[PDB]
């Protein structure tokens, strides 16, 4: 006999008696007065009695109380007399604490709120008894009925309870992503989870909205760059010293990699759960994305998009979640389907994308010729992979271009508080009036300088940033498999041309041709598949902690880009290839050590690059001239500025390609005449506009003296954009004419090009020799890439590689416009004032080739007005015979002697000047040159 061990068990766990002198403070109850009492007791804690204000701490407390009575009998003789009743108290207090977390209004105080919000403040101390309700509720059949009781509820504890659910709160949010962890580690509530009332946003609810009235919505946007935690760990003092802004970018940088890894596995288990749940996550993610597509404006709607703590913290979890089938062996490569846009898209609204090379009416035609395939596949691995995609452009690049603008943003608004700063205001209202707009602007001044530090610390968190770019990488990969027809690579080299080289791109707008040699899946794919992976990089560039730098698979992006640059089928857009051939520029660059670009090592071995970078580089700088865009049509002089830099880096420091350079001139003389054809006519001009603008600049600080203030601004800065654009350009072609002229002579004084270079060269010797330049007044020259001396050294110097070229000096001298000896005189001049020439041996040679222009000059005057008679345009131009019967060739417009083309025709039917295919019928003869030449035979007959 010894069951009274057991009401006094059943007392000190359950805390209550029934008599009213009880020495320890228990609960008292007035109704009927062993184990088969305490189903009653309970029900009564929790339904009549007042005094229990935190019901669900207390069958927490109890459970607690029985588990410690249970571990600390067993140790003892009296156990086995106990089992009886902590059994019974287990199988109640855990089933109603399931009822307290089912039922709303169940218990006499609180509701779902109350008990959560404990439950929040310390969870630990409620983990054990909450698993055993999870487990009791799905043994049951209505977990669903525990989760919409307490992640609902959870829900208006971030948004409510809460002055700000964000990294700040550190005891809050790591809690609450406790209680999600503990529950999402069991299977049967994973693949339900995404049934939850609230898991999806209503129709009605706005983007900005989507991290708050989301389920996932509040730990998805647990971020350092959230303006809050900025303001907090920055704005505190922002001017605090590099070393100690480097701690903090540390602190946050450690905090946010354990947010994204317990989010991440989060995540896991939901996509694990089932094929329905991770089919309704993609559904989750793809409508944040569809909706925050205005995060890639010139001027975000800030205030209805989703932020850039939420939309970056998903790109990075959708990155792990691809990471595994782009690793370096891609040999799960092909889980991906490449031809996952054939078919109308089923999450990702493609609706309004620009495609690689196509249209929307192709794209619907080419959803018509597909409809033959299975029209529903809702393939997870590949959805994965194309929203990462996606939110890499609309997630993580709105969220770069945001930080990106912020230094503009802080002077502009650091003139704007001056210039209220100075206002005087008399009438008390109008003081509190302008007191509260300085107020306004320095409150934004502190969070966007805050914010800004904020975003740096995260672009610069290299763990995470390099995650990133392995992924655009593997995306890279990927891409050039899509392209390539025999979906090899990267197990078979790709080859490239796809299509031949059109021998003459000198065909109407390759556009619709190009177009419709496109490659057969990729053409389709949306555009921001490219952009998102280029503005990423040319980004992330300017960290010193970059994730491109020395990183071993930068190759794999480098050979997608030589591809794109190869083959202009590929991508139509001219401004995106300028971001990549930019890009390019950026890895080719020197460094302060002058030694070579990080990428050049990659340009040197990559097989696939080095058998087309040179090539794509002179075809593209050739074709970006077929650009005409609003704002975008001085792209393509920046395009060739970075070429040109490209250029001349590989010539320097790779023979490899010094020789591809060398041998093109030579086995495809018409590719390359072909590009230093612009690089000729360009030059013509370039130095002319930077002077014309450097002027403009010069009388704009003039009208400064005290028209509108504003405009003078986005005008002078414009001026000066386009003088440093136009003078730096200049600068790279003259560099390139002199580096190559040096090697290959003979390839600059070939018909189509000499007399073109040496009116070019004379015209810019002329402007730098003379008032052009002299005259041109300026602040800092060189702020403009405008070294009037460089130009003229280099200018100098290409004369002087080409001065034993006869058709050289020939075309200088024949050069009527521009051509005097004066003009190598005073450049003589002007080189023997500073110490800067190879001369005076130099000026020795500049000097020698000026004579030998003049004597060449004297030569062609006297050999005209001595031993030519007959006027020039009465000779054919093959057999300069005085013609009897001239007739006109439709493409050069040359007249020539019926005669003479007959003669060519024969052998040859092509125009003798231009090879443009000719026929003898569609000559047109020339009656009006034929009289004035019977007119000259006849007065000719004197004697
Ligand atoms: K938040």
Redesign the pocket.
Same mark, same amino acid.
């Given at each position: 006999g010894s069951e009274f061990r057991s009401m006094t068990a059943i007392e000190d766990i359950l805390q209550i008696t029934t008599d009213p002198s009880d020495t320890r403070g228990y609960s008292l109850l007035k109704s009927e007065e062993g184990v088969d009492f305490i189903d009653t007791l309970l029900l009564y804690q929790l339904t009549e009695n007042e005094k229990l204000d935190k019901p669900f701490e207390y069958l927490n407390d109890c459970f607690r109380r029985n588990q410690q009575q249970k571990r600390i009998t067993k140790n003892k003789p009296n156990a086995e007399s106990l089992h009886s009743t902590f059994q019974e108290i287990d199988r109640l207090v855990i089933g109603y604490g399931v009822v307290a977390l089912q039922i709303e209004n169940f218990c006499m105080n609180g509701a779902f709120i109350n008990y959560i919000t404990g439950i929040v403040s310390n969870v630990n101390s409620y983990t054990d008894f909450l698993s055993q309700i999870i487990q009791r509720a799905i043994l049951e059949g209505t977990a669903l009925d525990l989760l919409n009781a307490v992640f609902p509820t959870l829900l208006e504890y971030c948004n409510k309870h809460v002055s700000?659910?964000?990294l700040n709160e550190s005891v809050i949010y790591n809690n609450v992503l406790t209680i999600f962890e503990l529950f999402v580690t069991f299977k049967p509530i994973a693949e339900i989870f995404t049934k939850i009332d609230g898991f999806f946003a209503d129709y009605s609810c706005k983007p900005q909205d989507f !991290?708050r009235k989301t389920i996932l919505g509040?730990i998805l946007?647990l971020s350092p760059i !959230?303006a809050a935690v900025a303001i907090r760990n920055y704005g505190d003092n922002l001017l605090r010293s590099k070393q100690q802004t480097a701690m903090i970018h540390e602190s946050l940088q450690a905090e946010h990699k354990v947010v994204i890894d317990r989010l991440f596995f989060i995540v896991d288990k939901l996509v694990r759960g089932s094929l329905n749940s991770r089919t309704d996550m993609i559904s989750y993610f793809a409508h944040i994305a569809n909706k925050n597509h205005l995060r890639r404006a010139d001027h975000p709607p800030f205030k209805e998009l989703s932020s850039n703590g939420f939309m970056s913290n998903i790109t990075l979890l959708l990155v792990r979640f691809s990471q595994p089938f782009l690793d370096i062996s891609y040999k799960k490569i092909d889980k991906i389907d490449a031809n996952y846009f054939n078919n109308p898209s089923l999450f990702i609204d493609l609706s309004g994308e620009t495609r690689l090379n196509s249209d929307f009416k192709e794209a619907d035609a080419f959803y018509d010729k597909n409809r033959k395939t299975a029209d529903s596949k809702p393939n997870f691995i590949s959805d994965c992979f194309f929203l990462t995609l996606t939110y890499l452009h609309y997630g993580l690049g709105g969220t770069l271009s945001f930080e990106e603008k912020m230094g503009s943003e802080i002077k502009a608004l650091k003139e704007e508080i001056e210039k209220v700063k100075k206002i005087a205001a008399n009438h008390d209202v109008f003081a509190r009036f302008i007191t509260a707009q300085l107020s306004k602007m320095e409150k934004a001044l502190k969070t966007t300088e805050s914010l800004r530090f904020a975003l740096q610390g995260f672009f610069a968190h290299r763990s995470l940033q390099l995650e990133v770019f392995d992924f655009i990488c593997g995306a890279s990969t990927f891409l050039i498999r899509v392209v390539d027809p025999e979906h090899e690579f990267p197990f078979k080299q790709i080859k490239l041309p796809l299509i031949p080289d059109q021998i003459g791109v000198e065909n109407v707008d390759n556009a619709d041709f190009l177009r419709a040699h496109a490659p057969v899946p990729f053409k389709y794919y949306p555009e921001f598949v490219v952009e998102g992976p280029v503005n990423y990089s040319l980004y992330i560039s300017k960290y010193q902690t970059s994730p491109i730098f020395r990183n071993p698979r930068l190759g794999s992006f480098v050979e997608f880009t030589t591809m794109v640059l190869r083959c202009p089928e590929l991508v139509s857009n001219p401004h995106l290839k300028g971001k990549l051939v930019q890009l390019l520029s950026v890895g080719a660059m020197p460094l302060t050590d002058n030694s070579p670009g990080f990428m050049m090592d990659i340009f040197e071995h990559d097989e696939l690059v080095n058998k087309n970078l040179l090539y794509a580089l002179l075809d593209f700088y050739v074709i970006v001239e077929k650009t005409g865009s609003s704002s975008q049509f001085y792209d393509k002089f920046n395009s060739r500025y970075s070429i040109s830099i490209i250029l001349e880096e590989l010539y320097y420091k790779i023979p490899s390609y010094k020789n591809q350079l060398i041998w093109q001139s030579q086995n495809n003389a018409d590719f390359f005449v072909r590009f230093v054809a612009r690089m000729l006519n360009d030059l013509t001009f370039l130095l002319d506009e930077g002077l014309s603008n450097l002027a403009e600049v010069h009388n704009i600080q003039n009208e400064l003296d005290n028209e509108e203030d504003k405009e003078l601004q986005t005008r002078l800065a414009s001026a000066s954009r386009q003088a440093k654009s136009s003078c730096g350009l200049a600068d790279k072609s003259m560099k390139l004419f002199e580096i190559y002229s040096k090697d290959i002579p003979a390839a600059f004084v070939t018909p189509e090009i000499v007399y073109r270079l040496a009116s070019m060269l004379n015209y810019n010797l002329e402007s730098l020799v003379g008032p052009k330049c002299g005259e041109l007044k300026v602040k800092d020259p060189q702020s403009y890439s405008f070294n009037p001396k460089d130009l003229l050294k280099a200018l100098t110097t290409v004369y002087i590689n080409l001065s034993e070229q006869s058709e050289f000096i020939s075309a200088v001298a024949k050069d009527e416009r521009s051509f005097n000896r004066n003009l190598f005189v005073r450049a003589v001049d002007i080189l023997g004032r500073k110490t800067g020439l190879a001369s005076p041996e130099f000026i020795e040679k500049l000097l020698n080739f000026a004579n030998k222009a003049e004597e060449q000059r004297k030569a062609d005057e006297e050999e005209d007005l001595e031993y030519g008679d007959v006027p020039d345009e009465f000779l054919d131009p093959l057999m300069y015979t005085i013609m009897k019967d001239p007739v006109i060739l439709p493409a050069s417009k040359m007249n020539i002697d019926r005669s003479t083309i007959k003669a060519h025709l024969l052998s040859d039917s092509t125009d003798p000047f231009n090879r443009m295919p000719l026929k003898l019928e569609d000559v047109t003869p020339n009656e009006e040159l034929r009289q004035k030449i019977l007119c000259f035979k006849k007065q000719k007959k004197e004697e």
């Open positions: 700000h659910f964000d !991290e509040p946007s !959230e």
